[PDB]
């Protein structure tokens, strides 16, 4: 994907086929993992274009209020994909009906630069210019967790370890960092007693998830001060619009 989206074969030095919806350039692309013949692309005019190799032509296009920097297809859902957008939001889309999004994620304060599905398909991780990595549950619209440190300067690549147990992050400081998918979990093999005891904490926590005290403890995170001031002012801006409208 450059000025034009081109299909290539390894054994042919020239581009085998030329795909293009229009004169616009293409910023990113991602093949599907289940319907491998379907491809999606991102354009600089704030557009998302879908393609099918079986027809060798683009299939559908939708224009957004802002550019999408990355697009990831759900490994467990062939028709379902997520898009990293420049309005601090990640949008979850069903291919067949693109007039609406399936879900929206809002917890970042800078444009999300990369997004990745867990190979299990039930979590998504997002990387943003705001020096943070967020993990979202697929059916929930807010991140369950935030990762950060001074030493990471701008997230541009975020990936899930193919076993779904770790997160790989790439930032502009020149370091590729590894993160646990779940901070409290440990990779060591557990005894059946530990497995049952550690499991019990989960359902019991899920059992009383919304209790006031547990919400105070469970939700709480150490967020960098730069992010909250962005969040706090953002909430003020949203409230003024809502009180207004």
């Amino acid at each position: 994907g450059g000025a034009k989206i081109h299909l290539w074969d390894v054994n042919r030095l020239k581009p085998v086929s030329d795909l293009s919806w229009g004169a616009d350039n293409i910023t990113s692309l991602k093949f599907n993992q289940n319907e491998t013949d379907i491809l999606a692309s991102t354009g600089s005019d704030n557009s998302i274009v879908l393609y099918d190799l079986r027809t060798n032509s683009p299939t559908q296009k939708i224009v957004q209020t802002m550019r999408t920097n990355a697009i990831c297809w759900n490994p467990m859902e062939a028709f379902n994909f997520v898009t990293a957008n420049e309005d601090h939001n990640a949008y979850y889309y069903d291919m067949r009906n693109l007039s609406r999004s399936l879900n929206v994620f809002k917890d970042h304060v800078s444009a999300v630069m990369d997004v990745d599905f867990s190979p299990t398909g039930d979590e998504i991780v997002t990387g943003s210019y705001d020096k943070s990595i967020r993990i979202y549950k697929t059916n929930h619209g807010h991140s369950r967790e935030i990762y950060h440190t001074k030493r990471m300067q701008h997230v541009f690549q975020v990936k899930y370890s193919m076993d779904s147990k770790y997160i790989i992050s790439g930032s502009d400081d020149g370091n590729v960092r590894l993160w646990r998918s779940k901070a409290w979990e440990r990779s060591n093999v557990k005894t059946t007693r530990e497995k049952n005891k550690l499991e019990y904490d989960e359902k019991l926590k899920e059992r009383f998830r919304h209790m006031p005290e547990i919400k105070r403890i469970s939700r709480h995170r150490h967020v960098p001060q730069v992010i909250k001031k962005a969040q706090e002012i953002k909430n003020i801006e949203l409230s003024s619009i809502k009180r207004r409208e």
């Binding site: 541009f156 193919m162 469970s218």
Partner: protein
């Protein structure tokens, strides 16, 4: 208990890249392998278990604008990766 166990960071891949990292590709067939690129035009293949590089190539004069790992079917012992850059070339 979960909070004082919340211990996410594990480590970093070797010494990283020279310039900012802009392209990471995972081996969908291998758990412990990555290809990473930076604006320096250098690409690195990593062994996640070792946090050490299989190899590093100064692939492009320009910026590594895309990176992907593949299993080319040319018409076990070696793996293959594809890199594209603003210098108007893609290298296997």
């Amino acid at each position: 208990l979960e909070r004082m166990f919340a211990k996410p960071f594990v480590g970093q891949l070797g010494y990283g890249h020279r310039d900012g990292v802009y392209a990471i590709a995972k081996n969908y067939g291998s758990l412990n392998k990555l290809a990473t690129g930076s604006a320096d035009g250098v690409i690195k293949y990593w062994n996640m278990s070792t946090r050490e590089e299989f190899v590093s190539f100064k692939a492009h004069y320009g910026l590594v604008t895309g990176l992907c790992v593949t299993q080319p079917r040319f018409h076990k012992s070696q793996n293959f990766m594809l890199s594209c850059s603003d210098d108007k070339t893609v290298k296997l």
